[PDB]
């Protein structure tokens, strides 16, 4: 049940930029889950599709 | 077109519909030296802007 867990969020990352506070125009690495891509998980441990 | 307000990157900032954008710049970006010749034909300009 967890290994299924760990088996889901093994990821690839990816640039971006983005916004904090101040129209301060940040440039950004991050890691893309599912979720990211759009398929957000619940604390109900069920899928939603974007 | 020599005096003006060299327009201050970050150190000005507002919000409204919780959305910040730095008026210091431009929408392009540009920090701007708006000559105006008095105070509130300056400030006209500021409605230009």
Known sequence: ?50 | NTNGLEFKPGDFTIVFNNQTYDLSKNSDGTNFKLTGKTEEELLQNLANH
């Open chain 1, 1 to 50: 049940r967890s290994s299924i867990l760990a088996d889901l969020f093994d990821s690839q990352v990816v640039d971006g930029t983005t916004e904090d506070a101040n129209g301060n125009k940040v440039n950004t690495k991050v890691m893309l889950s599912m979720q990211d891509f759009g398929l957000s998980l619940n604390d109900a441990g069920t899928l939603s599709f974007d």
